[PDB]
Design brief:
The structure is cut from a larger assembly and holds two copies of chain A and one copy of chain C (about 110 residues). Chain A has no helices and one strand. Chain C has one domain: Chitinase A, domain 3 (Roll), CATH 3.10.50.40. Helix content of chain C is about 10%, strand content about 35%. Chain C is built from two helices and six strands; from the N terminus they run E-E-E-H-E-H-E-E. The chains are: A mainly beta (about 50), C mainly beta (about 110). Chains in contact: A-B, A-C, B-C. At the A-B interface, strand 1 of A face strand 1 of B. Strand 1 of chain A pairs antiparallel with strand 1 of chain B, so a sheet runs across the interface. Chain C: It catalyses: [protein]-peptidylproline (omega=180) = [protein]-peptidylproline (omega=0). Chain C: Belongs to the FKBP-type PPIase family. FKBP1 subfamily. Chain C: It is a peripheral membrane protein.
């Protein structure tokens, strides 16, 4: 019933300029692959994970 | 939704995540450090 | 109802012993996902001695199964938790408790 308050970290999203999809008559290929390698991660830079 | 993988752990340094997309099924799959991830997304919308 | 899942591995060889103070950071959430406690908000690790019944059973068993440097999720049934009486204001009756515990060091 009462509004709840808590502190939350900001989150941001990053993408390559790669766009692939499926459509009838489409010139695009269907199967795609990519990888992400983690170098540094701070589990708790703030109270929120 | 939890997914089972060998050496299951939260994304840590030196980890490598391999993401695979098949638009025919459709299906999305992952591998962790070359190890299979025992879960998949499928039957999702292809509007975009 | 103590059920431990490993979020991040620890050493795997050093485990808490009775009479040994465990220092942890934790965030407490009910099964529905509402947070009710966090040591990190206060910025002070929580210290408790095993076998003195200071903490609930859920903690007593989970931290014992855990290892130094280990991060884990502990799911605790009400019986091992506060139970039917609950914690007035904080915890409702008959509530399963979900905890994210990082075991810093043993002293």
């Amino acid at each position: 019933l009462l509004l709840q308050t808590n502190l939350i970290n900001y989150v941001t999203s990053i993408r390559p300029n790669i766009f692939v999809g499926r459509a009838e008559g489409s010139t695009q290929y269907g199967k795609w692959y990519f990888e992400v390698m983690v170098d540094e991660v701070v589990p708790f830079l703030t109270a929120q994970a | 939704r939890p997914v089972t993988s060998p050496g299951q752990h939260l994304l840590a340094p030196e980890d490598v995540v391999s993401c695979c997309l098949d638009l025919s099924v459709p299906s999305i799959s992952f591998r962790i450090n070359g190890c299979p991830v025992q879960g998949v997304f499928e039957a999702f919308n292809l509007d975009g | 109802g103590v059920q431990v899942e490993t979020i991040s591995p620890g050493d795997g060889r050093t485990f808490p012993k009775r009479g040994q103070t465990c220092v942890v950071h934790y965030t407490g959430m009910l099964e529905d996902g509402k947070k009710f406690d966090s040591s990190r908000d206060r910025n002070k690790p929580f210290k408790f001695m095993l076998g003195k019944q200071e903490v609930i059973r859920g903690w007593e068993e989970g931290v014992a199964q855990m290892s130094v440097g280990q991060r884990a999720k502990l799911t605790i049934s009400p019986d091992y938790a506060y139970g039917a009486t609950g914690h007035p204001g904080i915890i409702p009756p008959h509530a399963t408790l979900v905890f994210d515990v990082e075991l810093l060091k043993l002293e």
